[PDB]
């Protein structure tokens, strides 16, 4: 059914129920000043097409489901407050002109026999009844066609993100996506951005290069294609002959099982039908590291439900795997327990050093020589993993296996027991060292980080990864430079404490998520609750003033938490470009969610707002799509409130000259079509095509982004400027014809000096004034923008003659009453000589102040646009 769609379309929105409350207000003939046409017809369009723009989605879902078998905008918040501001101002004037009309019905109304008719009516009671008339007559102060237009502007601006050929990857065939067509203007207002650093700032193309065993470094040129066995299919040009011959003969035990661990402790989908022994790993590390083992002979053949046929130098030895200690983002590691054919049970473990160093043996010779190795690897962007093992007596496996069987039964819930069983045995393990594998920055990332930084978008990198790979990658993508002063977290505790007892070009800092929450500290309760909150908000202020901060070693649970903090305790607008299942959390939190396709699952992609393939595509999303979207959006608002305030307020001025009685200064139908037909197209096209500069020049000058972030181009004051400039304009549209109507304006046998011709002249000078105003606003005059403006004015005049033709009069004499008014008001040279005057008086001061403001205070676009280069 389609009725439920409109039911919630009205209640949630502030204004959609407003005009519904008004429609009953105009329903009763007691206060029927403006007909229900004035609001019903524009209300159907704003609610009609708005449902069509969303009904397509529901229709698509129904089809896909049958044959097979919340983020809110800053601009949205302001508009709701503006409609409230129109509500108070409208009712303030509805009562502010009730005092003026209260007198008029006593002094002039009582004696005015042409108005009195013989029904007892108090001067203040007549003021009460009109108080509904003032509300009704000036109803269109609240823009009826706003919420429809906002959705269309965003939907169009979202499809440019999808359609961009320069945000479309080549080999992956992964165009950009705009999953949430609801926050486009925010892309131009982004203050903060967040990243994962794997699949975000890297390619996920991991090729084994180095490793550490027993504290020795392997992978350096010393003492070389792999042609000695069938398993080592040549695809990895290696060096360091010592490692090559170390496995041929004289194999050490630790070196031997080392490559074995890579080929067992993993979760790949091994293949044997092809005969080449391929690998398809869900995680980039396992796939590449396992491939390293096969190149060194330790090839993994196949795996069954409880057995694995791993091979070593052709010695196919089958292990019986009984349990698997899977890897989830929270635990940051993996382990496996297998039974060797001899009879023993062997435990292997791998993963990050932090969550594995917490469980080191009491003392190992390979402890320090390992610790000083990983940093050396990570110093040049190596994804180093610690690999360690342990052998447990059979008695240790006895008690450890029942609790699996208790946890093995699925039932309704099985999530907590598996957590405790993994930890307790794993607390002790025997280490070898750590591997190392390079994932190079994807091309264009240094440009976008540099370009967006000059656009004053603060960029943060959030990653549970090495505090070194991202820190070294940061300089490799211009995230950090010589000027910034990255410092360790020890000073933050002292400095942040130091300011606390006091209360009781870029800056950056390097910290760890394992330590991040220590700062947040994750009668005493109330004092301590505010104790950490003061540290919380203060620290976010130590972070908000930064365009590069290294927040790392943070789990999925700690991804969204950081995005919560700045989103809430700063009100700043947050985008997030993410990756994998581990970041689906924060991408929901941020105002804009972005997820890179990557090679670690379509999880962040499916839980985001705008998704594409490479971080370098973030350039055109913000500097071209977000930036234009904001300028296209909030230039639409300035013209959209203007065109309505300058529209109704003729009712205000004409009220002074009709007994404050709230008479319509326009035709009955000029109020309906004004918001949907006479000023809707040109402002919409400006909202989809208005390029202050070219796309190439938009990227060449990232400084144009300052407008959206600072919100200069629209504020609360600029809303009233669109009112006052609409008050001034409404006077000019009214009084210039008034002065020309007080005297003769060409009075002859055809003497137009009546109210209808007064209305037509005001209407004619209105559309031209505003449709030239939008023409004076469009910086990018496309042949469709020009068509929209002149077509709009031609459209106004085109159907006005139809509305004023004799043919339509017989159709609805009581509703289409203006007849021959334009044909008798637009043929007078005086009237056009007045419309030209009113239009000139409306626009020449505007052109003068636009030029004068552009001269004394040239805009950033203006200075850039004066040049042809």
């Amino acid at each position: 059914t389609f009725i439920p769609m409109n039911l919630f379309e009205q209640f949630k929105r502030a204004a959609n129920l407003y005009f519904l409350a008004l429609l009953i207000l105009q329903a009763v003939p007691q206060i029927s000043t403006l007909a229900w046409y004035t609001t019903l017809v524009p209300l159907l369009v704003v609610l009609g097409v708005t449902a069509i723009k969303d009904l397509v989605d529901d229709v698509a879902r129904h089809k896909m489901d049958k044959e097979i078998n919340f983020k809110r905008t800053k601009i949205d918040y302001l508009m709701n407050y503006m409609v409230y501001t129109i509500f108070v101002v409208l009712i303030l004037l509805s009562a502010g002109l009730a005092i003026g009309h209260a007198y008029w019905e006593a002094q002039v109304g009582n004696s005015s026999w042409y108005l009195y008719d013989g029904e007892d009516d108090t001067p203040s009671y007549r003021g009460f009844l009109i108080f509904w008339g003032y509300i009704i007559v000036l109803n269109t102060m609240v823009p009826i066609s706003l919420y429809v237009s906002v959705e269309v502007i965003r939907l169009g601006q979202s499809h440019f993100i999808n359609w961009d050929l320069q945000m479309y990857y080549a080999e992956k065939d992964t165009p950009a996506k705009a999953r949430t067509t609801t926050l486009n203007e925010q892309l131009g207002q982004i203050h903060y951005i967040f990243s994962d650093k794997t699949g975000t700032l890297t390619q996920n193309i991991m090729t084994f290069k180095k490793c550490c065993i027993n504290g020795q470094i392997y992978g350096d040129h010393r003492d070389v294609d792999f042609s000695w066995n069938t398993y080592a299919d040549g695809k990895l040009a290696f060096y360091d002959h010592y490692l090559i011959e170390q496995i041929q003969s004289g194999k050490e035990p630790e070196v031997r099982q080392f490559f074995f661990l890579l080929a067992v402790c993993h979760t790949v989908m091994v293949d044997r039908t092809d005969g080449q022994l391929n690998y398809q790993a869900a995680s980039p590390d396992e796939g590449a590291l396992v491939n390293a083992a096969r190149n060194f002979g330790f090839a993994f053949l196949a795996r069954t439900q409880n057995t694995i046929t791993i091979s070593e130098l052709g010695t196919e030895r089958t292990y019986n795997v009984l349990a698997i200690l899977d890897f989830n983002s929270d635990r940051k590691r993996m382990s496996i327990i297998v039974r060797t054919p001899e009879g023993n049970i062997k435990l292997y473990c791998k993963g990050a050093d932090t969550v594995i160093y917490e469980r080191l043996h009491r003392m190992n010779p390979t402890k320090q020589e390992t610790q000083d190795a990983l940093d050396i690897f990570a110093n040049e962007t190596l994804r180093t993993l610690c690999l360690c093992y342990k052998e447990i007596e059979e008695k240790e496996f006895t008690e450890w296996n029942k609790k699996f069987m208790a946890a093995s039964v699925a039932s309704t819930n099985r999530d907590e027991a598996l957590d405790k069983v993994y930890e307790e045995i794993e607390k002790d393990l025997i280490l070898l060292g750590a591997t190392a594998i390079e994932d190079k920055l994807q091309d264009g990332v240094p440009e976008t980080i540099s370009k967006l930084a000059k656009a004053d978008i603060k960029i943060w990198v959030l990653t549970g990864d090495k505090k070194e790979t991202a820190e070294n990658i940061g300089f490799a993508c211009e995230l950090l430079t010589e000027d910034t002063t990255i410092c360790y977290g020890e000073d933050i505790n002292s400095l942040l404490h130091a300011r606390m007892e006091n209360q009781r070009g870029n800056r950056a800092l390097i910290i760890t998520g394992s330590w991040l929450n220590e700062i947040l500290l994750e009668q005493s309760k109330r004092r301590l609750e505010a104790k950490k909150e003061q540290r919380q908000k203060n620290f976010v202020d130590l972070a908000c003033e930064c365009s590069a901060v290294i927040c790392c070693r943070v789990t999925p649970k700690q991804k969204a938490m950081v995005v919560d903090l700045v989103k809430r305790y700063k009100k700043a607008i947050t985008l997030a470009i993410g990756d994998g299942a581990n970041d689906v959390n924060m991408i929901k939190t941020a105002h804009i969610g972005v997820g890179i396709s990557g090679q670690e699952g379509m999880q962040a992609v499916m839980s985001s707002d705008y998704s594409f393939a490479q971080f370098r595509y973030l350039q055109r999303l913000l500097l071209v799509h977000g930036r234009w979207s904001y300028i296209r959006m909030c230039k639409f608002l300035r013209y959209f409130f203007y065109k309505n305030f300058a529209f109704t307020l003729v009712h205000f001025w004409y009220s002074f000259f009709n007994g404050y009685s709230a008479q319509t200064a326009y035709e009955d139908w000029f109020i309906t079509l004004y918001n949907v037909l006479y000023t809707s197209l040109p402002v919409l096209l400006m909202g989809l095509l208005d390029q202050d500069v070219s796309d190439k020049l938009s990227l060449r000058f990232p400084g144009l982004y300052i407008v959206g972030q600072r919100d200069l181009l629209f504020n609360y004051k600029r809303f009233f400027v669109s009112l006052l400039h609409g008050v001034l304009t409404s006077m000019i549209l009214f009084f210039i014809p008034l002065g020309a109507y007080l005297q003769t304006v060409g009075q002859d046998g055809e003497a137009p000096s009546d109210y209808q011709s007064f209305a037509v002249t005001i209407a004619s000078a209105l559309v031209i004034t505003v449709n030239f105003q939008i023409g004076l606003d469009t910086s990018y005059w496309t042949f469709v923008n020009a068509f929209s403006i002149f077509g709009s004015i031609a459209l106004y005049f085109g159907i006005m003659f139809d509305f004023h033709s004799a043919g339509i009069h017989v159709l609805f004499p009581s509703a289409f009453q203006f007849t021959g008014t334009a044909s008798n008001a637009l043929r007078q040279p005086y009237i056009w000589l007045t419309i030209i005057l009113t239009v000139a008086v409306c626009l020449l001061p505007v052109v003068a102040i636009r030029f004068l403001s552009m001269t004394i205070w040239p805009s950033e676009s203006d200075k850039i646009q004066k040049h042809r280069k």
């Binding site: 002039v108 004696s111 005015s112 026999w113 042409y114 108005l115 013989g118 009109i130 499809h159 999808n162 359609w163 050929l165 479309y168 065939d173 165009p175 996506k177 393939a613 004409y654 000259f657 007994g659 009685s661 008479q663 095509l689 390029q691 796309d695 020309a740 109507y741 007080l742 005297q743 003769t744 304006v745 060409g746 009075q747 002859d748 003497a751 000096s753 009546d754 109210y755 007064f758 910086s779 990018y780 005059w781 496309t782 042949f783 004799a806 009069h809 004499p813 009581s814 009453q817 021959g820 040279p829 005086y830 000589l833 005057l837 008086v841 020449l844 052109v847 003068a848 030029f851 004066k866």
Partner: protein
């Protein structure tokens, strides 16, 4: 995800366009050519308007010493006011006969709606069923008022007459024509009489006159082409003005056959049948005689305006040059 986005100018945001930039060389001249066309047109409007010969006469008689103050309280209903005026310069071409009403708000919200326009259109159903819009003047006692509405009810019903007092002192009446005061559209399109019939009497059955009118709408004019709802004065009246102080074309004075001026300079007398009370609400009544100008009528506001804005366009234009030169 999907295939390549097809490369088009529209989708790639590189449509052909002109980038109008408001340099000095493009804003400065548009100001002057405005200032060099608003001045000469302003001079054209102003001089022609001042070349239009016009005389205005206030005959309400509210102030003392006017020789029709008796008409403020017409103890006997028909009260006649006589005013003598002299024309210093003759009128050339046809002359328009007016009336005015100051401080008379014909544009009140309640007032304007008070009209069954469908019934003014001769809708057979609308005669006997006046709309709620003209609620207070729907019916007099039992049957509905055909010209319903406050406005149609409150019709200006004076009779301004012009007499030329020659050298012999014998008044010579001045011809005044009652046709062609309203628009062509209003006569035939907006305002229509009921359908059928031949005589306006049998056509307006079951309907009383408005309370204020002295006589029914049957014979508002002797000519059958100007009686009923197509009455010229009615259409001019009912076609509500935009302001309280407004003016309405009352009659025509076409050019005489002889070469002499239509209204030669001399002494003239205005004999008006006072029938419209405007002193209750501080209102006035006037009569204006105006000669045609080929370029509209006497509109000093437009003429003074074009001089005013035309100069300011030049003053704005000449202001802008200094800033441009200083910041070159």
């Amino acid at each position: 995800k999907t295939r390549r986005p097809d490369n088009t100018a529209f989708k790639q945001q590189r449509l052909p366009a002109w980038q109008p930039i408001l340099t000095a060389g493009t804003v400065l001249p548009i100001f002057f050519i405005i200032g060099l066309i608003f001045i000469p047109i302003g001079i054209g409007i102003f001089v022609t308007s001042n070349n239009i010969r016009e005389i205005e006469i206030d005959y309400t008689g509210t102030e003392p010493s006017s020789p029709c103050n008796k008409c403020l309280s017409p103890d006997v209903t028909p009260c006649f006011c006589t005013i003598n005026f002299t024309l210093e310069k003759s009128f050339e071409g046809n002359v328009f006969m007016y009336y005015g009403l100051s401080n008379f708000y014909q544009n009140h919200r309640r007032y304007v709606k008070s009209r069954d326009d469908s019934q003014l259109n001769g809708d057979s159903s609308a005669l006997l069923n006046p709309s709620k819009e003209c609620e207070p003047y729907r019916r007099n006692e039992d049957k509905p008022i055909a010209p319903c509405g406050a406005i149609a009810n409150s019709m200006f019903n004076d009779t301004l007459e012009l007499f030329l007092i020659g050298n012999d002192s014998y008044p010579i009446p001045i011809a005044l024509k009652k046709k062609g005061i309203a628009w062509w559209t209003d006569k035939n399109v907006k305002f229509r009489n009921p359908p059928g019939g031949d005589n306006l009497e049998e056509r307006f059955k079951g309907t009383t006159k408005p309370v204020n009118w002295l006589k029914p709408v049957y014979m508002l004019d002797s000519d059958p082409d100007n009686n009923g709802f197509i009455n010229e004065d009615f259409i001019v009246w009912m076609r509500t003005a935009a302001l309280p102080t407004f003016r309405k074309l009352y009659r025509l004075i076409e050019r005489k056959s002889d070469l002499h001026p239509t209204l030669p300079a001399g002494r003239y007398s205005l004999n008006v049948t006072y029938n419209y009370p405007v002193h209750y609400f501080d209102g006035r009544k006037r009569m204006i005689l105006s000669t045609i100008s080929w370029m509209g009528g006497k509109n000093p506001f437009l003429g003074i305006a074009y001089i005013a804005v035309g100069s300011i366009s030049f003053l704005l234009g000449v202001v802008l040059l200094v800033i441009n030169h200083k910041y070159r």
